[PDB]
């Protein structure tokens, strides 16, 4: 996250970090005690991955961390149907053992398709992660967060040569300086509705980070909430 602030412990208790052949390589959010939602481009291939919930500072111990192994990865079935487009950039991870929910480990809410879009169109969401804090720079030790405005589709389309599909949205500032970035992929874009946060987007891609005239591109979660609910049922 470029141009954000330090989170307080427990401020984003749905946020998790992913670790693998690279540490802190992506984020995710808690769907329920057994399931994380993240970006499909984070988990191409079946390399072994671990999830850490209740994480705050990734170089210190808070005694709130819960580490789990990933036993099943379900990228959306249309991800990579077309090469290099980031269309349908969303995936689910099943954990080996249930998370234990508490103040530091809490799911994000997920509304139906209609209300997820209504919440997105409120026009202001929070994004969070341990990704780069400068474009091509170092990663964060302390979880970062940033409020980003929704950007109108036409402006969105004009900002880039790359294709923005109806499964995506733009968010960020016209003057640049504040954005998500590499390492933040998979992290949740959330909309707060009278004290209760709902998942409205997933950090997916962009051109550099925080450049004036460019915006962060997010997976539009409203299009996928039916799929998330179908695949993450507990029994």
């Amino acid at each position: 996250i470029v141009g954000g602030e330090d989170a307080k412990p427990g401020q984003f208790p749905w946020q998790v970090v992913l670790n693998g052949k690279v540490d802190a390589f992506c984020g995710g959010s808690i769907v329920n005690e057994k399931w994380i939602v993240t970006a499909a481009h984070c988990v191409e291939t079946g390399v072994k991955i671990t999830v850490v919930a209740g994480e705050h500072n990734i170089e210190e111990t808070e005694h709130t961390e819960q580490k789990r192994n990933v036993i099943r990865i379900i990228p959306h079935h249309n991800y990579n149907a077309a090469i290099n487009t980031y269309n349908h950039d969303i995936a689910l991870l099943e954990l080996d053992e249930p998370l234990v929910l508490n103040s530091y480990v809490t799911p994000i809410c997920i509304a139906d398709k209609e209300y997820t879009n209504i919440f997105l169109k409120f026009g202001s969401g929070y994004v969070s992660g341990w990704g780069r804090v400068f474009h091509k720079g170092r990663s964060a030790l302390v979880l970062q967060y940033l409020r980003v405005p929704l950007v109108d589709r036409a402006t969105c389309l004009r900002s880039t040569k790359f294709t923005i599909t109806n499964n995506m949205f733009c968010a960020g500032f016209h003057e640049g300086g504040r954005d998500s970035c590499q390492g933040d992929s998979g992290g949740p874009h959330v909309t707060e509705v009278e004290g209760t946060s709902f998942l409205t987007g997933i950090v997916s891609w962009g051109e550099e980070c925080a450049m004036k005239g460019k915006y962060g591109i997010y997976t539009k979660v409203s299009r996928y909430v039916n799929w998330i609910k179908e695949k993450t049922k507990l029994t």
Binding site: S103, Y104, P107, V193
Partner: protein, 51 residues
Amino acid sequence: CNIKNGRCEQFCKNSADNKVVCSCTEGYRLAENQKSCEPAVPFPCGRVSVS
């Protein structure tokens, strides 16, 4: 549901006679005022409880 979400804290559906029915997401119950959403489990989704 037209204005202010029908006064529903979370979800609104139009019923009949221009009236509304509110509802809430998993982990919440419709409060008795039939608008607000109250926690129905120790750690409901989407809320900060460290503070």
